[PDB]
């Protein structure tokens, strides 16, 4: 049972701009996804301060980066608050319509694509490096869902029969053929050190056989 949705016109335009604009500094996608994970971790931490049972779904608060060269995927995993099905459909819990408007008003006014996270739409920077993005998420108040999009104006949502995650989100980047540098350990380490060195949760870079 797969539901297919149209992006709002403004979000489709944002994704088109990200995919078609010549812009060499693609590495900032990772900082944006790690920052999103940190924000989601902050949220479940705050909820747990007054209700410790919020962590019954998992006490550990962390971020894992998992490259897989056989699948050509880079996965950013966190044990943050996750998203409900409603959140997923509603632009992954963001105010992406108004954020896009502000972002595109900044671009013609001096800004560049690297400032996308200041407008609350940093998730879509995934499409700098990914031909397809899969988002698997579990929120304490809902079941486990998979969102997916290869851009082109539409996204899908289905219940996820995959490996139960407990609580949190996995962002699976199906990398473009010419972007496989982002699977190499030394490249990922360099980027995390450059742009994510002060994130307040452990970031574990997995290695491959
Ligand atoms: C905005 C967004 C998109 C995809 C995943 C996540 C996350 N890690 O919870 C967020 C905050």
Swiss-Prot record:
Subcellular location: Nucleus; Cytoplasm; Melanosome; Cell membrane
Effect in UniProt of substituting residue 82 to D: Abolishes ATPase activity
Transmembrane region(s): none
N6-acetyllysine PTM sites in chain numbering: 43, 69
Binding site for ATP: 36, 78, 97, 123
Modification after translation: ISGylated.
Superkingdom of the source species: Eukaryota
Residue span of region Interaction with NR3C1: 1-209
Family membership noted in the UniProt record: Belongs to the heat shock protein 90 family.
Complexes and interactors: Homodimer. Identified in NR3C1/GCR steroid receptor-chaperone complexes formed at least by NR3C1, HSP90AA1 and a variety of proteins containing TPR repeats such as FKBP4, FKBP5, PPID, PPP5C or STIP1. Forms a complex containing HSP90AA1, TSC1 and TSC2; TSC1 is required to recruit TCS2 to the complex. The closed form interacts (via the middle domain and TPR repeat-binding motif) with co-chaperone TSC1 (via C-terminus). Interacts with TOM34. Interacts with TERT; the interaction, together with PTGES3, is required for correct assembly and stabilization of the TERT holoenzyme complex. (Microbial infection) Interacts with herpes simplex virus 1 protein US11; this interaction inhibits TBK1-induced interferon production.
Function per UniProt: Molecular chaperone that promotes the maturation, structural maintenance and proper regulation of specific target proteins involved for instance in cell cycle control and signal transduction. Undergoes a functional cycle that is linked to its ATPase activity which is essential for its chaperone activity. This cycle probably induces conformational changes in the client proteins, thereby causing their activation. Interacts dynamically with various co-chaperones that modulate its substrate recognition, ATPase cycle and chaperone function.
Domain comment in the entry: The TPR repeat-binding motif mediates interaction with TPR repeat-containing proteins like the co-chaperone STUB1.
Protein name from the UniProt record: Heat shock protein HSP 90-alpha
């Amino acid at each position: 049972e797969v539901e297919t949705f149209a992006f709002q016109a403004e979000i489709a335009q944002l994704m088109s701009l990200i995919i078609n604009t010549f812009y060499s500094n693609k590495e900032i996608f990772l900082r944006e996804l790690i920052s999103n994970s940190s924000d989601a971790l902050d949220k479940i931490r705050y909820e747990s301060l007054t209700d410790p049972s919020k962590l019954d779904s998992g006490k550990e608060l962390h971020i894992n980066l998992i490259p897989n060269k056989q699948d050509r995927t880079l996965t950013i995993v966190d044990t943050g608050i996750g998203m409900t099905k409603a959140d997923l459909i509603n632009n992954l819990g963001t105010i992406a319509k108004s954020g896009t408007k502000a972002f595109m008003e900044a671009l013609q006014a001096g800004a560049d694509i690297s400032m996308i996270g200041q407008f609350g739409v940093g998730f879509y920077s995934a499409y700098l490096v990914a031909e397809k993005v899969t988002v698997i998420t579990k929120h304490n108040d809902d079941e486990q869902y998979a969102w997916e999009s290869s851009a082109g104006g539409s996204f899908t949502v289905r219940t996820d029969t995959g490996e139960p995650m407990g609580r949190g989100t996995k962002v699976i980047l199906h990398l473009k053929e010419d972007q496989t540098e982002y699977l190499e350990e030394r490249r990922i380490k360099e980027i995390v050190k450059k742009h994510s060195q002060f994130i307040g949760y452990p970031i574990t870079l997995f290695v491959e056989k």
